[PDB]
């Protein structure tokens, strides 16, 4: 698609009889805009992007009351889950959840998501149809029958097709100078000598948004994944991203090799080289 | 905006 909105839940039990922790983060594409952490005296939902700040105290109470309720329910769920897998209170366990809507190349809903994991592995996921579930084992099937009796799938469909989409469009407009303004990467190639296998070429891409980018080294023959070190995309902190790919080995020369940058912020994919 | 969990929404 073109744009997405996602909520990430992390429910974690505490070592013994301790009260579990509930965390929620909300994203629109790669921009985080809200947070909740149950581990505070009086936990409140907080803004994390400058465009969600215009929202009234009714918006913030709705959020806070949903996450304060999730805190109590995810606690019951963590206990239900350790029962399924016959685990003691001794250990700490994690329920993770990802839900959200993808707007279309137009801006209508492409598809909806609702995936859960237990201790970092898939447990239950809402199918593309937003009507059925994919359970991983017999324990996730206990959750499926609970969620079928509670009409969870139908209530996700209503949310994802409506509420989720309306608010994403709302945020997209309110933050259109950030969320709808693609930042092209600040690109340069650096030279890092060694005499023996000869020097190293580092192709940088800096201060770009969204996170989706592609860096390849073409000595002509094509993209050559084997001799390239492609470091994964990292955030700079200013809501922008960084990435580099390097090659070693002229086996030829540093000027034979050219870097290729693919990003939305570019009118056409770049052809970058090292300039001595 | 997040979705509210209705009653009996537990794992």
């Amino acid at each position, epitope marked *: 698609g073109s744009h997405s909105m996602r909520y990430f839940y992390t429910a974690m039990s505490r070592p013994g009889r301790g009260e579990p922790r509930f965390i929620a983060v909300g994203y629109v594409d790669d921009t985080q805009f809200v947070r909740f952490d149950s581990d505070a005296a009086s936990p409140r939902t907080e803004p994390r992007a400058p465009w969600i700040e215009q929202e009234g105290p009714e918006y913030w109470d709705r959020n806070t009351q949903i996450f304060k309720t999730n805190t*109590q329910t995810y606690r019951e769920s963590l206990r239900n889950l350790r029962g399924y897998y016959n685990q003691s209170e001794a250990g700490s366990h994690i329920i993770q959840r990802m839900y959200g809507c993808d707007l279309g190349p137009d801006g209508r809903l492409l598809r909806g998501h609702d995936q859960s994991a237990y201790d970092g592995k898939d447990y239950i996921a809402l199918n593309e149809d937003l009507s059925s579930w994919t359970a991983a084992d017999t324990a996730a099937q206990i959750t499926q029958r609970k969620w079928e009796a*509670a*009409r969870v799938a139908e*209530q996700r469909r209503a*949310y994802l097709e*409506g509420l989720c989409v309306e608010w994403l469009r709302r945020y997209l407009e309110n933050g259109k100078e950030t969320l709808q303004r693609a930042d092209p990467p600040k690109t340069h190639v650096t030279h890092h000598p060694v005499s023996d296998h000869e020097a190293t070429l580092r192709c940088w891409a800096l201060g770009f948004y969204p996170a989706e980018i592609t860096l390849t080294w073409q000595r002509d023959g094509e993209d050559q994944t084997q001799d390239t070190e492609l470091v994964e995309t990292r955030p700079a902190g200013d809501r922008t991203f960084q990435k580099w790919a390097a090659v070693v080995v002229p086996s030829g020369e540093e000027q034979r090799y050219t870097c290729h940058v693919q990003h939305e912020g570019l009118p056409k994919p770049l052809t970058l080289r090292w300039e001595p | 905006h997040p*979705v*509210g969990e209705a009653d*009996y929404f537990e794992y």
Partner: T-cell receptor
Amino acid sequence: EDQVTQSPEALRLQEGESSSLNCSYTVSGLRGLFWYRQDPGKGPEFLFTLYSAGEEKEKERLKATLTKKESFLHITAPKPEDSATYLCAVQDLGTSGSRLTFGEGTQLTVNP
Amino acid sequence: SGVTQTPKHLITATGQRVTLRCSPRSGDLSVYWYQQSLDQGLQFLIQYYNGEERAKGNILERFSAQQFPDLHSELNLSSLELGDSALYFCASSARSGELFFGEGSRLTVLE
């Protein structure tokens, strides 16, 4: 922000005279709209639930329909036994739990 | 319905305290308290799920309720005023989301 407006508050029909009861609603996200029937002295009685615009539920002389803004409870050829208060309620997606926000109702009296 | 409310009727004086009992439907784990003031609609007071308080409406500080481990609820109304005269309904929610109401409790408060 959760408002349920029912019209008319009072309805005075002649036996056999069909009428439509309006229920206007504002919600963050619709979880479901409910129609209850309430007799004087007793508690609201569950009739049916509509989740999506175009969904229709029918129990005898009562038919309910849903739009993105309102719900209609159509009463066909009413009888004196249909005289009661008809309550409209809504469940919100943007709030927790299954709580209902009630409308003030449509007090119906069917003249026999 | 399946929900049971006691007492169905209560006549007390101003400044007194009353306790309203509610048993949800067999199988239902939640309790919802509603107030229906004379010639006025149902107003959400408080909700309990499995002995634990969840959602809170416009229940007064003077009012308190709780859900017991056997799932039954008690709504206590203290420092009673004439205006506290209403119909008090409790509802239990189905697993599929519909609420089911009791007969109610009609409280009349007199000077």
